[model samples]
Structures are given as structure tokens and as C-alpha cells.
Target: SPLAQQIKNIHSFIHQAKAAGRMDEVRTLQENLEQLMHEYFQ
Candidate 1:
């Protein structure tokens, strides 16, 4: 499934956001990822 891919994308986006000083984007992405996780696994 694309869940694993989504996780990897999330990881990469998080790392990039950190490196790029995009805290707001990071937070949004994190929330999105969390929601995706809940939807997929809960």
C-alpha cells in the first residue's frame, strides 16, 4: 500500500522542513501525517 510511502514522504518532508526553518509547515505536515496514521491504522 501507499501508507509506507506516505510515511517516508512525511519523514522526508519533516527533515526538510526542519532544515529549511519552516516550523509552521512542519507542524501542518506533522498533523497531516498524524491524521493519515490514525485513518490508516486506527
Candidate 2:
């Protein structure tokens, strides 16, 4: 699925979070993204 594409290029999300100075958000997103991946791969 396209979700994999987003996860594959996840660096952009990290970069965007950095640009916004929202390191906390990165962690939050990491958790949620991981959760999604867990479900998606199942």
C-alpha cells in the first residue's frame, strides 16, 4: 500500500518535524507510525 511508501521515505517526516522544531512530535509520530506498521504487516 501507499502507506509503505510513506514509511519507506520516513526521513522526510523526521525532517519536517525538525523544521517545525517539534522533536516531541517526532516521537509521537514514531509511536503511531510503528503501530500502523504493526497492523499493516499483519
Judged by lDDT against the true structure, how good is candidate 2? 0.80
Q: How close is candidate 1 to the true structure, as a TM-score?
A: 0.82
- Model 2 spans > 4 angstroms off: 1-13
Q: lDDT score of model 1?
A: 0.89
Point to the candidate with the largest lDDT: 1
lDDT (Cα atoms) of all candidates against the true structure: 0.89, 0.80
> Per-residue error at 32 for model 2, in Å?
0.8
Model 1 alpha-carbon miss at residue 24, Å: 0.7
Q: Model 2 misses residue 10 by how many Å? A: 7.3
Would you estimate the TM-scores of all the predictions?
0.82, 0.60
lDDT of 1 at 32: 83
lDDT of 1 by residue, 14-34 (tens): 999989999999999999899
